[PDB]
Design a protein around this ligand. Structure first.
Ligand SMILES: Cc1cc2nc3c(=O)[nH]c(=O)nc-3n(C[C@H](O)[C@H](O)[C@H](O)COP(=O)(O)O)c2cc1C
Ligand SMILES: Cc1cc2nc3c(=O)[nH]c(=O)nc-3n(C[C@H](O)[C@H](O)[C@H](O)COP(=O)(O)O)c2cc1C
Ligand SMILES: O=C(O)[C@@H]1CC=CC2=Nc3ccccc3N[C@H]21
Lengths: 202, 206
């Protein structure tokens, strides 16, 4: 759109999409894309009905990307029975998308403890009182209970349901606007020995 | 905290619980237009394959209908193939400037070809050549060949026939959520689910 949007990988077909992912994200940070790690994450229920919401990617790992949430949320309950998920990053400023597909696996509690402690302590009170995605019966009661905890010197204990998922990637697509509406689509699929890569028609 | 929004985003509906969620959708979209949100109708649309594995991509909401939202695509694309077997979908709008999300869940129905003809004609004609030559989401074997083919069609400098497979879907909504940042991190989540008659409305915990 409004900012420079280089996509040399569409020509060169790099072998490792995780390198491409790292490079796109680092560039997004450098050029000042607004909230580049806001991932629209899709899960599905036992009938195959998708649900979506934004989550923040907290880190990139060897196998994929990592985010935190509550296990009893809708996404948590869906992932418990159906680990397959997909997320899209969309950067308006550069007209670029990254699509991330794979299986999300809940990481151990020590990882969750560390993630919880790395959040700003001001987030701990509400995340402790709320049972994410359950019906809220009394707004003021929640507000007041969190205010009681906000008086404390953080950090608070990690709540039982606070968890970290790693989305272990099986495929990725990098999308750019291209020239003459020939949008540039670079698609990776995991193989037994590495990754296959192809271009897709726009 | 990753949230960067700083624009006031009134959410009286979280207090008043309107019976009819499409009015809330209209209110929020109209405000987004008035305050200048960038691409508010860029919808991250999720579909699922035959085994329930999701896929996602951005599409644009072209219209708000009585039942839901409308978008166009190619029937042979991944999303089109997925929807034709499993009509259930979900999409999310996220507006950074106001820290608002809208989650839209329902069943997508392919509209008649007359509707697709009209939508096709409403697109700028400069978009017609590439959309005609491209079989969306199939492997692209020769970039230059596609480029050259589209350039030849573009010489017409006018509208082309609607391609087989260019289609319009209406996502007929079964549930919605309106999410606002709220105060003191008590994010404001207003959730609607269709009932036998009308809608049920609830607040959700953040
Ligand atoms: C910009 C943004 C970032 C968010 N990041 C997270 C996150 O990382 N983890 C989380 O659980 N919820 C996050 N949320 C809240 C989710 O969108 C959602 O409301 C919540 O996770 C419940 O989703 P569910 O009911 O579909 O499970 C974020 C919301 C916004 C607007
Ligand atoms: C801002 C933006 C808007 C888009 N709008 C549409 C659209 O309305 N319809 C469409 O078919 N593809 C649209 N695309 C392209 C899709 O994201 C996607 O690449 C294409 O539809 C193929 O998706 P699929 O392979 O998952 O079916 C848009 C892409 C961007 C970046
Ligand atoms: O950037 C952030 O902190 C996110 C902004 C809005 C809501 C969030 N909810 C979370 C819930 C659990 C774990 C992380 C979250 N991130 C924030």
């Amino acid at each position: 759109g409004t900012l420079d949007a280089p996509f040399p990988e569409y020509q060169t077909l790099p072998a490792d999409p995780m390198s491409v992912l790292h490079n796109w994200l680092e560039r997004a940070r450098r050029v000042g894309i607004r909230e580049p790690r806001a991932l629209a994450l899709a899960t599905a229920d036992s009938q195959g009905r998708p649900s979506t919401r934004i989550v923040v990617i907290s880190e990139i790992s060897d196998a994929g990307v990592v985010f935190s949430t509550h296990a009893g949320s809708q996404k948590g309950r869906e992932l418990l029975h159906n680990p397959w998920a997909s997320g899209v990053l969309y950067w308006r400023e550069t007209s670029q998308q990254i699509i991330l597909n794979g299986q999300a696996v809940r990481l151990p509690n020590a990882k969750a403890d560390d993630a919880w402690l790395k959040r700003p302590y001001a987030t701990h009170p509400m995340s402790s009182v709320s049972r994410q995605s359950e019906e809220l019966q009394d707004v003021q009661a929640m507000r007041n209970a969190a205010r009681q905890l906000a008086e404390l010197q953080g950090p608070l204990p990690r709540p039982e349901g606070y968890c970290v998922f790693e989305l272990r990637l099986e495929s990725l697509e990098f999308w750019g606007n291209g020239q003459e509406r020939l949008h540039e689509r670079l698609r990776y699929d995991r193989s037994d020995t590495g990754w296959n890569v192809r271009r897709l028609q726009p």
